[PDB]
Design a protein around this ligand. Structure first.
Ligand SMILES: *SC[C@H](NC(=O)CC[C@H](N)C(=O)O)C(=O)NCC(=O)O
Ligand SMILES: N[C@@H](CCC(=O)N[C@@H](CS)C(=O)NCC(=O)O)C(=O)O
Lengths: 352, 338
């Protein structure tokens, strides 16, 4: 009773040399859920690379029923870092009891699908390939011209977004931002690989396990690898403390990252899990030896620095979508669909 | 539901008079209400006077169940603590998962009920204070059982130290009763009204109420710690803790009744009953100190607290909360050291 994630089927790229998918403003779209850490990676990267006006964004409802992600039945919204969803601008979730699973609050629960009016993401999948027979996942990077799915693998979408493909369409400060610098690329790929299996996906192999033996194995594995991240960050903090002195908290945080001394894709990919860990994964996926906030001081400093001090993280993080999606959609974990109010707050302030 | 058997034991009682070897206490180690009675039985020196047996932690549709002298007169009926995945719900580890029922060989606690009252139609709860002579239930309300135990009824059969222990001293009775009253509604029962709510509106109301009242207990204890620190100095933790209680400056029934909820809070109520604004260990330092002092320094608390029974009971029995019956491994540890 283990969880075996399907492999994504749409794995193409965008480039000037490409025969079909060439770069342009106003041609590609990013369809996401704000609940989904994989899709979350693509929203952070789109903001950091200055692509919000180049690639529009729409947002499915947080509630996932048996027919898959759905939309509700504007230029500021499409080019907003979170598709215009108002809760992503908030730093904490509030009451949930009055929100039903059929809630239809336009630009709060979801956006529409603004090009074809589709009600289901499955519609995009079947437009691209009428013979598709896998799961209808987010994120989707969509090409308006051919009406196909270019890529639905978040690890590749974020490399496309960071690549030179869209450089003609952004300001030179954003062009220069590089989330996968060559000097760090192999370290980034090494770190990503083990964080993928043991944390990003590890929390899902833990929470979706249907046999307790598999639950126990996977939860032990999650916390063993958080310990490894904590160790990496603790050693890094110690070196920064030596370099700049404990009193210079702002120069220290300016270099306080998982890989190297700059923000990279490694931080983005870890963040989308860690920022969900205390709000959902502890209670809902039973990943509860300890919490980030209580048990992992260096991870907790690192994630708070990213959340509070980087708009691309803060304003793509929607704690209402996060909590409601998991607790209201996973009937075999939470049969009555009651969303826990805690922990409070969703992410603590960065107190010095 | 309100408990049906509400009799007492006393030298004047027409039926139930005090004696050694006459009365029995049937408990679950998972149930906080029954846990109150075990703690009180130990504090009052009654383990040889009043035997104990222990139902299985798993609660199925036919009610609490048993497996098919050193143990009877032990603080926890002889149960010893042995991952959870290898433990199935029908596990049969003698003196680990449960005891038998030694007097009649009954497999079900409903058998005791039906013997006492063949027309019984309510729930088959623990704790049960049983009379071996008449084969009836004397009392099945934990708040009364602990007053029977603390009363003068069994004084002839205990040593002189225990006879003198008074968990409800008259000098503190209005303070104890006041604290017990709101702690019962908002904390002891508050966690169940939260965890068993079937409508989110009810869950949210009750969980806010739980933490609002934990805040009140925390203030009480914070204020008490402040005065103790000034009276003894902060380095003299031993003298301070010897007076660090919820009511007064001595150990009372108020501490006992609070403890059986607080000791279950981080191991289970946070995750399982969604009482998760914060945890005791992370969010309530004075409660946290108070509960560790009782657990680590008082044998009547420590050796009646079984974290395996606690975590397994709730996670394995409540199908509408945890449909697959997978017991979370955390938090680690069950109770932090002192
Ligand atoms: S903790 C398990 C339950 N005990 C009680 O409800 C005792 C409540 C009394 N008010 C008391 O003694 O304090 C229990 O036994 N549940 C079984 C059931 O079927 O409800
Ligand atoms: N490997 C994919 C995983 C994407 C994914 O699985 N998303 C989940 C939710 S976060 C989803 O869309 N699930 C829909 C389903 O499986 O029905 C990626 O990284 O992009």
């Amino acid at each position: 009773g283990a969880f075996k994630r399907q492999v994504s089927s749409f794995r193409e790229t965008i480039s000037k040399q490409h025969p079909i998918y060439k770069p342009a403003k106003g041609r590609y779209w990013l369809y996401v859920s704000l609940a989904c850490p994989w899709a979350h990676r693509t929203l952070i990267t789109r903001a950091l690379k200055g692509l919000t006006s180049v690639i529009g964004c729409s947002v499915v409802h947080w509630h996932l029923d048996e027919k898959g992600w759905r939309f509700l039945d504007f230029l500021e919204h499409w080019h907003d870092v979170a598709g215009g969803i108002r809760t992503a601008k908030e730093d904490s979730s509030k009451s949930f009891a009055e929100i039903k699973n059929d809630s239809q609050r336009f630009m709060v629960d979801a956006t529409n699908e603004p090009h074809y009016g589709y009600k289901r993401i499955s519609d995009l999948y079947y437009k691209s390939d009428p013979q598709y027979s896998a799961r209808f996942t987010v994120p989707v990077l969509w090409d308006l011209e051919t009406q196909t799915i270019v890529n639905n693998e978040s690890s590749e979408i974020i490399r496309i977004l960071n690549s030179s493909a869209f450089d003609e369409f952004v300001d030179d400060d954003h062009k220069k931002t590089d989330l996968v610098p060559a000097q760090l690329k192999t370290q980034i790929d090494d770190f990503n690989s083990w964080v993928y299996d043991s944390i990003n996906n590890g929390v899902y192999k833990t929470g979706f396990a249907e046999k307790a033996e598999v639950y126990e194995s996977e939860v032990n594995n999650v916390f063993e690898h958080l310990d490894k991240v904590e160790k990496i960050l603790s050693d890094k903090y110690s070196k920064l403390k030596a370099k700049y002195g404990e009193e210079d908290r702002q120069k220290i945080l300016g270099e306080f990252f998982t890989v190297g001394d700059q923000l990279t894709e490694a931080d983005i990919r870890l963040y989308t899990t860690v920022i969900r860990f205390d709000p959902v994964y502890v209670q809902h996926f039973k990943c509860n030896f300890t919490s980030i906030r209580a048990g992992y001081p260096f991870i907790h400093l690192w994630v708070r620095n990213l959340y509070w001090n980087y708009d691309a993280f803060r304003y793509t993080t929607d704690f209402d979508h996060i909590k409601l999606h998991y607790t209201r959609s996973h009937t075999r974990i939470n049969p009555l669909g009651i969303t826990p109010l805690g922990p409070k707050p969703d992410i603590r302030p960065l107190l010095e």
